Amino acid sequence: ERKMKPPVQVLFPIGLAGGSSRDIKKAAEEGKVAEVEIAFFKCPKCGHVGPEHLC
Amino acid sequence: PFEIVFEGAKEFAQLIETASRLIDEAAFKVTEEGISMRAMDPSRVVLIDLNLPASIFSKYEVDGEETIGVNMDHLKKVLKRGKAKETLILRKGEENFLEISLQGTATRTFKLPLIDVEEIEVDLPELPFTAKVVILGDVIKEAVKDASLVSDSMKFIAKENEFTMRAEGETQEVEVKLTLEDEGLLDIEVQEETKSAYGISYLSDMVKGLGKADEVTIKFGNEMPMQMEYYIRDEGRLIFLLAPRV
Amino acid sequence: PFEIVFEGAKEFAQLIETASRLIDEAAFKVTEEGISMRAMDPSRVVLIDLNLPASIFSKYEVDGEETIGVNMDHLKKVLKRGKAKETLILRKGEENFLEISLQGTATRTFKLPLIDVEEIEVDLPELPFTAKVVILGDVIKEAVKDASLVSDSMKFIAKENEFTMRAEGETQEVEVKLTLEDEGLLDIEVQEETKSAYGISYLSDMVKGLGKADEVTIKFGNEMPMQMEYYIRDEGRLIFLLAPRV
Amino acid sequence: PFEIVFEGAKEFAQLIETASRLIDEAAFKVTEEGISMRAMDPSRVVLIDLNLPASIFSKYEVDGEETIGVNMDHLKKVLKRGKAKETLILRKGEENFLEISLQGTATRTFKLPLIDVEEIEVDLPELPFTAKVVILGDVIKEAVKDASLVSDSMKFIAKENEFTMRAEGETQEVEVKLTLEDEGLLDIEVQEETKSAYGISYLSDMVKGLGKADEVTIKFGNEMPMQMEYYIRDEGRLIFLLAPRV
Amino acid sequence: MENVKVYGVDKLKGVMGMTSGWKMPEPLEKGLLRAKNDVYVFKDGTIRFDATDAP
DNA sequence: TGCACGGCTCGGCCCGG
DNA sequence: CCGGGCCGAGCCGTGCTTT
Ligand SMILES: [Zn+2]
């Protein structure tokens, strides 16, 4: 098969909040807060802002 | 030059291990009354106080006062070698070397170096503790171990004839309630309602290695550091001061 | 809003741990008769069916029928905190949470939010099982361990008044045989010659945690799935349906 | 074709595991008297000799004499699969396969393929040993465990009615001393003052596996190898030879 | 997890940081389904299999 | 561009005290 | 029966004739 140098399953930035293996689930479980360069989108109607394509 | 004798090397080893989980190096003061220590965590969160009156030790001979500075890791590893029924002896002579003799079926002697450590005197007098409670070690140990699952901060709540520890997470939640009818809470004396929060890691480190059948006195107030203490061999005692979070 | 009480929380913890070693999610039916659960492992090779009649509960108060979906890992971790003497209480109000209370020297309550686990109906009709043997958990546990030690798969061969189980490796060989005159087996009834093979991973997963003094009933035939089952408190029951190889 | 029966497979497993720590392959010599083994490790620093006469064996049946070779890892695992109260059975036929069976609550038989190993017969003549000390296994085990704390080498110093094992590091030091009047030492027979040192790795590897209550006799001289002895059920014996340091 | 109804996933690997000039993230639902089905992703968002070729 | 060594961390087993 | 010790796994690193 084909895998990245560290195997990846989703193209989502996490930083160091997941550990060496960049585990998103582990970071989510421990209620951590992650700071990373990402793109946000804004809903025209109400004003929700986040890294999503649908409000 | 002093000679100090103690039975039950494992008890002394556990005391030292508890003391050494927060301070990498500390200095013990030896005096005719006994032994005492006072250090502070590197992050300035947890304070450790020690007191071992001379009545605890089987034999206590010393003239004058001397300061003892030893690396805590090496001493911990050395004392970890003592079985339950070993007799532990601490000795010193003219040379600036600390001897640790363990006596059992076979006699074994260790020699350790002394490293000078700066001593800073920080004594905190009585502070206004609205609520004071005394509970068994098992109750608090289990409460902390349960609260460790949901989150990393534990909340203490005290009321008239009521003691509550709770934790909250993103989706889960735990809560333990105690009352005078219960056997966990020996006695509660609260002048007015109070509440605080503390870090789980510090609480686990402080409460770990605590006798299941013991008596622990907890004193705290509205958003102020808590005080926990318990007697050792009916004479010595420990004290912990943990800073509140947020 | 039902309420259920069970004495011996550790038994329930072990039962749920055994049941959750194959399925990552599960939906439990609550009915007037008792709790019920069924699911398939992700690989779609083992079927787990669990039945807990209302008789085995110290208390059982149900006023309807519903389903509760909980994540198996969280429930398992919470249930691991119960001692052998605790009494376990499960209740659910009009709110969308499950409250797990452990009672004893003190009361400790957890809160798990229910999830929306989808339902998939699956049931297999009674199969014609030529050979049926009941044994003790320890012998099967050791035999599976040995087969895993040598080979990667096991073969179940049974004849008139004789039950044997082999595991042929690449070069090595393991042979375990038993007879009704032996203490391992309790009885045998073989309609005709039978033999089959099954994987070792699933067998090790399901047979693990078996007690020494537990009777296990095994039914199998020629190249068709094996059925293993054992009783909980003389009324409950847990069943597995392991598919064959080739 | 032989039939060997041994009671207490756990002790046999322990003996073989202790023997296998230093070496990888060995050839077992079996004759009308018993079983004997001897080998040297790949580093040419330790020589291990083992014998087991027929007196210890519950049942012995051998015709002629043969040497049987097999990998130590697989045999060690198969023996580790045994229990405390089972009876080990070593049997073989014309086919060159070693069949091991354990007959306890149930009978299980494994097959272990044979292997041919070159035999290099070497006997080191008995040397002039200036000291013979008999001590319990526990004292030496604990002394090695302490000595490994400060340095990677250990020192012996025999004297008239005096034995002491030391160890020194960069700063720390360790010393253990005992006398005839003590309960840890049984008999000491020194002709002249002796001093030697041995690596802690090999001493730790070979000592591990001695019961707390046991008899161990050590023969060593001035800057010459060391010999360690202890009986297996009062008939067999195990011989260890360790080259000195410096 | 609520959106795709996939709750049993234990690990979910991500990336330390995005190398594109937009730094748009991928939806987490796709990552959850990939983790559930045991497949890995590539730099452009596709799953690939490499093999030697013969005629 | 595949191989070979050497610092962590990090859970799952075990075994004995 | 609860806890240390030990042992894989899995990430980050190096290095691959030269007067
Ligand atoms: Zn919107």
mmCIF file of C-alpha atoms in Angstrom, chain C residues 72-223:
data_model
loop_
_atom_site.group_PDB
_atom_site.id
_atom_site.type_symbol
_atom_site.label_atom_id
_atom_site.label_comp_id
_atom_site.label_asym_id
_atom_site.label_seq_id
_atom_site.Cartn_x
_atom_site.Cartn_y
_atom_site.Cartn_z
ATOM 1 C CA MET C 72 -18.478 0.373 25.740
ATOM 2 C CA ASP C 73 -15.107 1.824 26.772
ATOM 3 C CA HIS C 74 -16.547 4.438 29.137
ATOM 4 C CA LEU C 75 -18.987 2.003 30.747
ATOM 5 C CA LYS C 76 -16.232 -0.589 31.139
ATOM 6 C CA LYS C 77 -13.845 1.871 32.786
ATOM 7 C CA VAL C 78 -16.542 3.134 35.153
ATOM 8 C CA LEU C 79 -17.579 -0.399 36.121
ATOM 9 C CA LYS C 80 -13.971 -1.371 36.846
ATOM 10 C CA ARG C 81 -14.096 0.887 39.928
ATOM 11 C CA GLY C 82 -16.437 -1.423 41.874
ATOM 12 C CA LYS C 83 -15.116 -3.651 44.641
ATOM 13 C CA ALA C 84 -16.215 -7.235 45.226
ATOM 14 C CA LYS C 85 -18.636 -6.209 48.003
ATOM 15 C CA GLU C 86 -20.258 -3.170 46.359
ATOM 16 C CA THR C 87 -23.887 -3.121 45.256
ATOM 17 C CA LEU C 88 -24.431 -1.617 41.803
ATOM 18 C CA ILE C 89 -27.402 0.615 40.942
ATOM 19 C CA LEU C 90 -28.454 1.680 37.438
ATOM 20 C CA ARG C 91 -31.151 4.313 36.965
ATOM 21 C CA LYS C 92 -32.323 6.735 34.292
ATOM 22 C CA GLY C 93 -34.645 9.692 34.788
ATOM 23 C CA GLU C 94 -36.421 11.709 32.129
ATOM 24 C CA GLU C 95 -33.025 13.251 31.296
ATOM 25 C CA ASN C 96 -30.806 11.778 28.568
ATOM 26 C CA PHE C 97 -28.127 10.353 30.872
ATOM 27 C CA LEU C 98 -27.327 7.079 32.615
ATOM 28 C CA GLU C 99 -26.454 7.190 36.321
ATOM 29 C CA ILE C 100 -24.191 4.414 37.618
ATOM 30 C CA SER C 101 -24.122 4.406 41.424
ATOM 31 C CA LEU C 102 -21.813 2.205 43.493
ATOM 32 C CA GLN C 103 -22.830 1.748 47.131
ATOM 33 C CA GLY C 104 -20.882 0.623 50.183
ATOM 34 C CA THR C 105 -18.817 2.563 52.704
ATOM 35 C CA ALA C 106 -19.683 5.597 50.550
ATOM 36 C CA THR C 107 -21.866 6.545 47.585
ATOM 37 C CA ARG C 108 -20.222 7.336 44.241
ATOM 38 C CA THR C 109 -22.291 8.332 41.207
ATOM 39 C CA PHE C 110 -21.190 8.647 37.577
ATOM 40 C CA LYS C 111 -23.052 10.198 34.636
ATOM 41 C CA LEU C 112 -22.721 8.835 31.095
ATOM 42 C CA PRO C 113 -24.598 10.590 28.265
ATOM 43 C CA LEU C 114 -26.538 8.241 26.020
ATOM 44 C CA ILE C 115 -25.552 8.000 22.354
ATOM 45 C CA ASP C 116 -27.616 7.152 19.275
ATOM 46 C CA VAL C 117 -26.343 3.687 18.388
ATOM 47 C CA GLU C 118 -28.183 2.391 15.334
ATOM 48 C CA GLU C 119 -30.033 -0.926 15.533
ATOM 49 C CA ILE C 120 -29.369 -3.895 13.243
ATOM 50 C CA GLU C 121 -31.532 -6.992 13.679
ATOM 51 C CA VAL C 122 -29.803 -10.374 13.386
ATOM 52 C CA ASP C 123 -30.769 -13.810 14.700
ATOM 53 C CA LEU C 124 -29.808 -17.340 13.698
ATOM 54 C CA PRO C 125 -32.236 -20.290 13.770
ATOM 55 C CA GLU C 126 -31.551 -23.430 15.750
ATOM 56 C CA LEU C 127 -28.862 -25.445 13.992
ATOM 57 C CA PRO C 128 -28.482 -29.251 13.824
ATOM 58 C CA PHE C 129 -25.565 -29.827 16.198
ATOM 59 C CA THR C 130 -24.278 -33.383 15.855
ATOM 60 C CA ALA C 131 -21.810 -33.209 18.767
ATOM 61 C CA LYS C 132 -22.288 -31.477 22.125
ATOM 62 C CA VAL C 133 -19.783 -31.410 24.997
ATOM 63 C CA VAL C 134 -19.711 -29.511 28.301
ATOM 64 C CA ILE C 135 -16.341 -28.840 29.945
ATOM 65 C CA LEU C 136 -14.715 -26.520 32.484
ATOM 66 C CA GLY C 137 -13.255 -23.130 31.647
ATOM 67 C CA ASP C 138 -9.697 -23.823 32.780
ATOM 68 C CA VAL C 139 -9.023 -26.695 30.374
ATOM 69 C CA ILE C 140 -10.285 -24.760 27.349
ATOM 70 C CA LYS C 141 -8.279 -21.717 28.435
ATOM 71 C CA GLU C 142 -5.030 -23.685 28.678
ATOM 72 C CA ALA C 143 -5.714 -25.535 25.422
ATOM 73 C CA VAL C 144 -6.309 -22.289 23.526
ATOM 74 C CA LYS C 145 -3.147 -20.842 25.054
ATOM 75 C CA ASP C 146 -1.101 -23.840 23.895
ATOM 76 C CA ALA C 147 -2.581 -23.745 20.393
ATOM 77 C CA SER C 148 -1.705 -20.051 20.156
ATOM 78 C CA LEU C 149 1.776 -20.967 21.392
ATOM 79 C CA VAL C 150 2.324 -23.439 18.544
ATOM 80 C CA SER C 151 -0.146 -22.736 15.728
ATOM 81 C CA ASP C 152 -2.500 -19.988 14.565
ATOM 82 C CA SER C 153 -5.679 -22.111 14.295
ATOM 83 C CA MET C 154 -7.333 -24.897 16.268
ATOM 84 C CA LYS C 155 -9.228 -28.040 15.279
ATOM 85 C CA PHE C 156 -12.099 -29.476 17.325
ATOM 86 C CA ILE C 157 -12.449 -33.251 16.882
ATOM 87 C CA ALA C 158 -14.882 -35.322 18.946
ATOM 88 C CA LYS C 159 -15.800 -39.007 18.807
ATOM 89 C CA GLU C 160 -17.803 -41.470 20.908
ATOM 90 C CA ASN C 161 -16.885 -40.749 24.545
ATOM 91 C CA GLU C 162 -13.752 -38.848 23.513
ATOM 92 C CA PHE C 163 -13.052 -35.144 22.958
ATOM 93 C CA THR C 164 -9.720 -33.998 21.526
ATOM 94 C CA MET C 165 -8.436 -30.654 20.265
ATOM 95 C CA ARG C 166 -5.319 -30.284 18.131
ATOM 96 C CA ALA C 167 -3.160 -27.428 16.873
ATOM 97 C CA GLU C 168 -0.694 -28.212 14.084
ATOM 98 C CA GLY C 169 1.985 -25.570 13.590
ATOM 99 C CA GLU C 170 4.384 -25.138 10.713
ATOM 100 C CA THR C 171 6.621 -27.839 12.236
ATOM 101 C CA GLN C 172 5.523 -28.424 15.848
ATOM 102 C CA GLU C 173 2.429 -30.262 17.097
ATOM 103 C CA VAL C 174 0.029 -30.021 20.040
ATOM 104 C CA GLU C 175 -2.447 -32.729 21.034
ATOM 105 C CA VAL C 176 -4.967 -32.519 23.882
ATOM 106 C CA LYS C 177 -7.446 -35.366 24.357
ATOM 107 C CA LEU C 178 -10.017 -36.095 27.052
ATOM 108 C CA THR C 179 -12.608 -38.719 27.940
ATOM 109 C CA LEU C 180 -15.825 -38.694 29.946
ATOM 110 C CA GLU C 181 -13.969 -40.778 32.531
ATOM 111 C CA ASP C 182 -11.660 -37.769 32.911
ATOM 112 C CA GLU C 183 -12.483 -34.889 35.244
ATOM 113 C CA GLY C 184 -12.216 -32.261 32.499
ATOM 114 C CA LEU C 185 -15.388 -33.342 30.706
ATOM 115 C CA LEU C 186 -18.844 -33.690 32.239
ATOM 116 C CA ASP C 187 -20.634 -35.570 29.437
ATOM 117 C CA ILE C 188 -20.625 -36.173 25.687
ATOM 118 C CA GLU C 189 -23.201 -37.154 23.077
ATOM 119 C CA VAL C 190 -21.959 -37.490 19.490
ATOM 120 C CA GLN C 191 -24.551 -38.122 16.789
ATOM 121 C CA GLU C 192 -21.766 -38.993 14.327
ATOM 122 C CA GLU C 193 -18.148 -38.205 13.496
ATOM 123 C CA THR C 194 -17.411 -34.476 13.670
ATOM 124 C CA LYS C 195 -14.465 -32.146 13.102
ATOM 125 C CA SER C 196 -13.852 -28.496 12.216
ATOM 126 C CA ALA C 197 -11.371 -25.635 12.576
ATOM 127 C CA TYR C 198 -11.617 -22.089 13.933
ATOM 128 C CA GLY C 199 -9.381 -19.078 14.357
ATOM 129 C CA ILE C 200 -7.265 -18.627 17.469
ATOM 130 C CA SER C 201 -7.568 -14.858 17.880
ATOM 131 C CA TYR C 202 -11.330 -14.873 18.426
ATOM 132 C CA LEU C 203 -11.150 -17.999 20.582
ATOM 133 C CA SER C 204 -8.530 -16.394 22.823
ATOM 134 C CA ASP C 205 -10.578 -13.194 23.032
ATOM 135 C CA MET C 206 -13.795 -14.944 24.055
ATOM 136 C CA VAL C 207 -12.391 -17.720 26.272
ATOM 137 C CA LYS C 208 -10.273 -15.259 28.255
ATOM 138 C CA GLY C 209 -11.547 -14.337 31.696
ATOM 139 C CA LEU C 210 -13.226 -17.713 32.195
ATOM 140 C CA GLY C 211 -13.414 -18.954 35.761
ATOM 141 C CA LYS C 212 -11.886 -22.209 36.921
ATOM 142 C CA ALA C 213 -15.125 -23.628 38.362
ATOM 143 C CA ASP C 214 -17.376 -22.769 35.425
ATOM 144 C CA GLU C 215 -19.199 -25.157 33.097
ATOM 145 C CA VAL C 216 -19.128 -24.283 29.391
ATOM 146 C CA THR C 217 -21.400 -25.959 26.837
ATOM 147 C CA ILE C 218 -19.968 -26.291 23.320
ATOM 148 C CA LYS C 219 -21.948 -27.383 20.258
ATOM 149 C CA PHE C 220 -20.472 -27.872 16.794
ATOM 150 C CA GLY C 221 -20.614 -30.069 13.717
ATOM 151 C CA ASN C 222 -19.003 -30.416 10.287
ATOM 152 C CA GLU C 223 -17.677 -27.138 8.866
#
